[PDB]
Curated annotation (Swiss-Prot), chain A:
This protein binds specifically to 23S rRNA; its binding is stimulated by other ribosomal proteins, e.g. uL4, bL17, and bL20. It is important during the early stages of 50S assembly. It makes multiple contacts with different domains of the 23S rRNA in the assembled 50S subunit and ribosome. L-tryptophan binds at K90. CDD domains: Ribosomal_L22. The lineage of its organism: Bacteria, Pseudomonadati, Pseudomonadota, Gammaproteobacteria, Enterobacterales. Changing A93 to S/T/V: Abolishes translation elongation arrest of SecM. The keyword Membrane does not apply. Keywords: Antibiotic resistance, Ribonucleoprotein, Ribosomal protein, RNA-binding, rRNA-binding. GO terms for molecular function: large ribosomal subunit rRNA binding; structural constituent of ribosome. The wild-type allele (erythromycin sensitive) is dominant over the resistant allele, and is also dominant over the temperature-sensitive allele at both low and high temperatures. This is Large ribosomal subunit protein uL22. Belongs to the universal ribosomal protein uL22 family. The keyword Ribonucleoprotein applies.
Swiss-Prot record, chain B:
Belongs to the bacterial ribosomal protein bL20 family. The keyword Ubl conjugation does not apply. GO terms for molecular function: large ribosomal subunit rRNA binding; mRNA binding; mRNA regulatory element binding translation repressor activity; structural constituent of ribosome. The keyword Ribonucleoprotein applies. Keywords: Ribonucleoprotein, Ribosomal protein, RNA-binding, rRNA-binding. It holds the Pfam family Ribosomal_L20. The gene is rplT. GO terms for cellular component: cytoplasm; cytosol; cytosolic large ribosomal subunit. This is Large ribosomal subunit protein bL20.
Swiss-Prot record, chain D:
The gene is rplD. This is Large ribosomal subunit protein uL4. The chain holds residues 52 to 201 of 201 of the full protein. One of its GO terms (molecular function) is mRNA 5'-UTR binding. Changing A109V: Does not regulate the S10 operon; assembles into ribosomes in vivo. One of the primary rRNA binding proteins, this protein initially binds near the 5'-end of the 23S rRNA. It is important during the early stages of 50S assembly. It makes multiple contacts with different domains of the 23S rRNA in the assembled 50S subunit and ribosome. Protein uL4 is a both a transcriptional repressor and a translational repressor protein; these two functions are independent of each other. It regulates transcription of the S10 operon (to which uL4 belongs) by causing premature termination of transcription within the S10 leader; termination absolutely requires the NusA protein. uL4 controls the translation of the S10 operon by binding to its mRNA. The regions of uL4 that control regulation (residues 131-210) are different from those required for ribosome assembly (residues 89-103).
UniProtKB/Swiss-Prot annotation, chain E:
This is Large ribosomal subunit protein uL13. Belongs to the universal ribosomal protein uL13 family. GO terms for molecular function: large ribosomal subunit rRNA binding; mRNA 5'-UTR binding; mRNA binding; structural constituent of ribosome; zinc ion binding. Keywords: Ribonucleoprotein, Ribosomal protein. It comes from the Bacteria.
Length: 110, 117, 56, 150, 140
RNA sequence: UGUAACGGGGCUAAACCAUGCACCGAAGCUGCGGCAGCGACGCUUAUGCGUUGUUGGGUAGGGGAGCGUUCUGUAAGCCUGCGAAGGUGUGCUGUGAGGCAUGCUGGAGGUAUCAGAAGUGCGAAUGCUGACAUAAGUAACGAUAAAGCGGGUGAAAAGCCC
RNA sequence: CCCGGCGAGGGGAGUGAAAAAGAACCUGAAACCGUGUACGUACAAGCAGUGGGAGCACGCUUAGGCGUGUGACUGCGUACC
């Protein structure tokens, strides 16, 4: 498990935030930034700054190798709850959300 | 008298029931199978132990026609022959010994052949 | 009309196929041993070796 | 309740609704939907439900229970911590401390741990006879005919 | 202590050269199905999942004997109910082994269940001792 | 608007009729368990166990009976911080609401007795209070009408600014 | 103490019996979801089935017919009120 620096909370939905996690599984910790900073979305840049927070700690905090910590899973969760309004019908619809996200990175070793 | 609905409402639905799927979202896994529709699945077994057996009947009695028809000894017209003898009636399953007893089963036709044939 | 039809399950929420990313490679090239992009020499000042646009 | 009657608005022009009554006893911030009637009723025991073979438990138990000794005088009473010894002649130490007697004397410290309201003086209260083990009646001849109540 | 025959996949396929071609065909085209399930191989799994391989020899000699063979249409109209229509009769179509006058199983496993994967196992070539496009280990 | 009268496929006899005859064969009466009513027996008798007869689909009605989230009681009485208990699933137990147990947990609680009856045993009031799983990448994205660099500062400027 | 944005969140420390009591303070399930152990598996019909069982990730047995679920084959059927 080793390191889990998730970040809060974004403005985006968990759908756009989840679209990139699978790319960085298993075999990309050595050189993690290129796929994430050159796909310059408020998802990928967030998984970048997550990964960065998580692994700049790990090498110090344990004594492990910064190149063998295999970036094993990366999942996400929402919440708790947030609302705002835009009076489009001003008695019915009117009620936009922030489902928000926090990226459960889970890094681990080979 | 305060009720607040409890104790029994989930007991009559799942608890110990070894089953993991079950009719998906809106017809079940919400709640709506729990009270009035749970009978349905087991109710395919309500009769048909007696009705599906026909499907397999032909499998046993094959070893009393599959080689005999060639020698002419066709199972139902050979039975109006057999069932002249008040000692032989229960040919219906137990004759299944013919699919491996072959080389000595092959003489059981000789018995009465000069009268029975 | 109003949405009188089924939730976003399996055949819809599955659809990910062609919504995918472009799995870009990258060159280590210590001419710019930090601030470089995929093969794009520097993301800002437009350097390569000496004086080009506004580098050095 | 305070809750606004009766009715807010007419209920057309959307294509989905049920109700609008505000109260109605069903929904929210109310209430006792069964008319709010103070059920003030004294379920009436009759005259010869007490006369009335009522005392006859001491014929079923008949061995360990009705405990016939003497009158309510023998306690201090400033030290009911001492009572269980003055209770060895009806054997039961502290089990259920009554006697079914009459005269005003100092024995009534006998309720100090909770037990019963004692009631003592002639009108023994039927709910003392059902169903304790030491249904004690102790005293001398006031038991004759209607007196059996004691 | 069970009496049934799972899988069986497939134990008995009976590599028989169908000398029946034309000569008595309408007496055993009607029974290709009760063959690939039974009447000899009924000894195993006489209703389920199995396979079969007769050794085919010719096609256009369907024989069939009657007024049927010269006005009985075959239809398919495979697209948008076809519109414009097709009517070549059973001896004039049988001039090709195709999809409906050659297989017999199309008439006999008719919805597709039991039949849903073993479609070409009989080869569906035709041509006798000029062209044996079938098995090399000894046929029957 | 695809030949669409056995369901197919049209079988020159397999057939049509007439005489024989053996298998298939709803639930249908048989093996054999189990047994709610109304009767008849051996006898018992507070009353019942089995034999024997009629026979066991049951929303309008009268009969007749089972159990509970706990309130009002069985009860300084036995039980619990050595765990009193859910959502649950080791194992079966009854004709049934369900459990006596128990498995893995929680972290404080009960009626194997009968006595008590009414906030009274939910999924269908076009639901209801706060909602949102929901239409996808949900405006016409805010008229379609504006641009251009060279820089400057800086944690980040198509906007701030020369 | 450490890490990033002189930030969020974590990973140990620790007042604590506890951080599944952490200042989006309730010892806590309900609509929906992210990655995984195994599936059936991009020729689909027909309330997504209980069957009847072949062998599969796995866990018992000097062998001993199983303690597990997506459910190849396909049988049955139209669960409502």
């Amino acid at each position: 498990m080793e390191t889990i620096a998730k970040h809060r909370h974004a403005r985006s939905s968990a759908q756009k935030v989840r679209l990139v996690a699978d790319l960085i599984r298993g075999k990309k910790v050595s050189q993690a930034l290129d796929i994430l900073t050159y796909t310059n979305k408020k998802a990928a840049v967030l998984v970048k700054k997550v990964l960065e927070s998580a692994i700049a700690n790990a090498e110090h905090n344990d004594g492990a190798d910064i190149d063998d910590l295999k970036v094993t899973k990366i999942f996400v969760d929402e919440g708790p709850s947030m609302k705002r309004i835009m009076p489009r019908a001003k008695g019915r619809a009117d009620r936009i959300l922030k489902r928000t996200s926090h990226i459960t990175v889970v890094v681990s070793d080979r | 008298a305060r009720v607040k609905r409890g104790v029994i409402a989930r007991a009559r639905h799942k608890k110990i029931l070894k089953q993991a799927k079950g009719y998906y979202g809106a017809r079940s896994r919400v709640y709506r199978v729990a009270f009035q529709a749970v009978i349905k699945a087991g109710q395919y077994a309500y009769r048909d132990r007696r009705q599906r057996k026909r499907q397999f009947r032909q499998l046993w009695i094959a070893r009393i026609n599959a080689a005999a028809r060639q020698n002419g000894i066709s199972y139902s017209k050979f039975i109006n022959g057999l069932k002249k003898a008040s000692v032989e009636i229960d040919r219906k399953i137990l004759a299944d010994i013919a699919v491996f007893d072959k080389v000595a089963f092959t003489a059981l036709v000789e018995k009465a052949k000069a009268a029975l044939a | 009309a109003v949405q009188q039809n089924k939730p976003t399950r399996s055949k819809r929420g599955m659809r990910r196929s062609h919504d995918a990313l472009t799995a870009v490679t990258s060159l280590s090239v210590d001419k710019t041993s930090g601030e470089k992009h995929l093969r794009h020499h520097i993301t800002a000042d437009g350097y390569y070796r000496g004086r080009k646009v506004i580098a050095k | 309740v305070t809750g606004s009657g009766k009715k807010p608005w007419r209920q057309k022009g959307t294509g989905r609704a049920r109700s609008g009554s505000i109260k109605s006893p069903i929904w929210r911030s109310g209430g006792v939907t069964f008319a709010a009637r103070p059920q003030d009723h004294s379920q009436k025991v009759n005259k010869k439900m007490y006369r009335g073979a009522l005392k006859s438990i001491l014929s079923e138990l008949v061995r360990q229970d009705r405990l016939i000794v003497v009158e309510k005088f023998s306690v201090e009473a400033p030290k009911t911590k001492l009572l269980a010894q003055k209770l060895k002649d009806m054997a039961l130490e502290d089990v259920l401390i009554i006697t079914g007697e009459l005269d005003e004397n100092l024995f009534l410290a006998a309720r100090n741990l909770h037990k019963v309201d004692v009631r003592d003086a002639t009108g023994i209260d039927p709910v003392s006879l059902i169903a304790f083990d030491k249904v004690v009646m102790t005293a001398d001849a006031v038991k004759q005919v209607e007196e059996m109540l004691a | 202590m069970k009496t049934f025959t799972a899988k069986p996949e497939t134990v008995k396929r009976d590599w028989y050269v169908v000398d029946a071609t034309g000569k008595t065909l309408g007496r055993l085209a009607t029974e290709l199905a009760r063959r690939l399930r039974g009447k000899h191989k009924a000894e195993y799994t006489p209703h389920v999942d199995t396979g079969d391989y007769i050794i085919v020899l010719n096609a256009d000699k369907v024989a069939v004997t009657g007024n049927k063979r010269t006005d009985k249409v075959y239809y398919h109209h495979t697209g948008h109910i076809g519109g414009i229509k097709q009517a070549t009769f059973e001896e004039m179509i049988a001039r090709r082994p195709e999809r409906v006058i050659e297989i017999a199983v199309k008439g006999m496993l008719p919805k597709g269940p039991l039949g849903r994967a073993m479609f070409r196992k009989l080869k569906v070539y035709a041509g006798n001792e000029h062209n044996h496009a079938a098995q090399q280990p000894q046929v029957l």
